[PDB]
Ligand binder design. Structure first.
Ligand SMILES: NC(=O)c1ccc2c(c1)CCCO2
Ligand SMILES: [Cl-]
Ligand SMILES: [Cl-]
Ligand SMILES: [Cl-]
Ligand SMILES: [Cl-]
Ligand SMILES: [Mg+2]
Length: 346
């Protein structure tokens, strides 16, 4: 066990191993209570997150377990990974705080998206799809890909963030808000049981915005946003209508006058024809028919970066706990086991 020291940060007393020095608050609070630090063991600048009230309720205790399980599993160059996890507690009975350590990531894709060449768009979207192929191979659905969840460095290298945090609330999704502009229509409107294909819609929205400098579907509310979507991709045909299992939602969408899909070469004026082709394959209303991440990596738009021997998949991820009902102290004991069993990367 390392020696720990105490310091007052972010309105509480932080207690951390001596290896972490020069702690200072960082960020806007989006991912929790976070401080930057220098890790003297590795030489890395790191982010240290101290969870607030991780076990106050069943929902909070299970969410804490979920975040730790997901972060411990992710081992890929284009996905956030866990450098360390620690608690000052010496036993389960005194366990009450969890600290998570990752690489410090200053800028996100907003902070860049600058004059982006087509070569830049190729490299950025390639890296998102490489990470997504890995995530999806573990049967994990991201659900919230958007520019603020994509960390990028000075060499254009990218990592995907946002695993195991609280589900977004109805109020967070209301109005003229970026948290809804990237969502697939079937999840925005609860049309049907959704699956991993929601994430490919989000990638299409991001790619369009890198190419034009403008939000693709900046709706002022759910209904305005649906109208923007259907104007570009067309109103649904009978085949998709059958798959909308919500009778109410199916009835509303039939109240709208029918519209054909637009010509994407006339929407994305001047863009690489291979980029136009890929956008047409991602932004398909029927999710069954969208291109997958593994298929998209082989598209000719990425010919300069694609290497099928360097696009790895994930070890299997058991998420049977998601359907399990346990008491607070049982989720807490599972979390403690995962803290003490952590093995750091090479
Ligand atoms: N769960 C996440 O996706 C996530 C994102 C950022 C982040 C952390 C965790 C912990 C260290 C601070 O920064
Ligand atoms: Cl990482
Ligand atoms: Cl503790
Ligand atoms: Cl964003
Ligand atoms: Cl969500
Ligand atoms: Mg989110």
């Amino acid at each position: 066990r390392p020696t720990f020291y105490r310091q007052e940060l972010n309105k509480t007393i932080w207690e951390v191993p001596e290896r972490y020095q020069n702690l200072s608050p960082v960020g806007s609070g989006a991912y929790g209570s976070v401080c930057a630090a220098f890790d003297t063991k590795t030489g890395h600048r790191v982010a240290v997150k101290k969870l607030s009230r991780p076990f106050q309720s069943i929902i909070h205790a299970k969410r804490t377990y979920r975040e730790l399980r997901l972060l411990k599993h992710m081992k890929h160059e284009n996905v956030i990974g866990l450098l360390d996890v620690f608690t000052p507690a010496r036993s389960l009975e005194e366990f009450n705080d969890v600290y998570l350590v990752t690489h410090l990531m200053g800028a996100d894709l907003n902070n860049i998206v600058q004059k982006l060449t087509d070569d830049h768009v190729q490299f950025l979207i390639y890296q998102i799809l490489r990470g997504l192929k890995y995530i999806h191979s573990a049967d994990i659905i991201h659900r919230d890909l958007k520019p603020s969840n994509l960390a990028v460095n000075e060499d254009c290298e990218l990592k995907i963030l946002d695993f195991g945090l609280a589900r977004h609330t109805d109020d967070e999704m209301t109005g003229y808000v970026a948290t809804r502009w990237y969502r697939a229509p079937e999840i925005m409107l609860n049309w049907m049981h959704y699956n991993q294909t929601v994430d490919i819609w989000s990638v299409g929205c991001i790619m369009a915005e890198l190419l034009t400098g403008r939000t693709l579907f900046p709706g002022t509310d759910h209904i305005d946003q649906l109208k923007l979507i259907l104007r570009l991709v067309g109103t649904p045909g009978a085949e998709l209508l059958k798959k909308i299992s919500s009778e109410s939602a199916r009835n509303y969408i039939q109240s709208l006058a029918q519209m054909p899909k637009m010509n994407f070469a006339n929407v994305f004026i001047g863009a690489n024809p291979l980029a136009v082709d890929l956008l047409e394959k991602m932004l398909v209303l029927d999710s069954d028919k969208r291109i997958t991440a593994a298929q998209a990596l082989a598209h000719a738009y990425f010919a300069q970066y694609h290497d099928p021997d360097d696009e790895p998949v994930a070890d299997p991820y058991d998420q049977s706990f998601e359907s399990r009902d346990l008491l607070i102290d049982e989720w807490k004991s599972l979390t403690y086991d995962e803290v003490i069993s952590f093995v750091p990367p090479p």
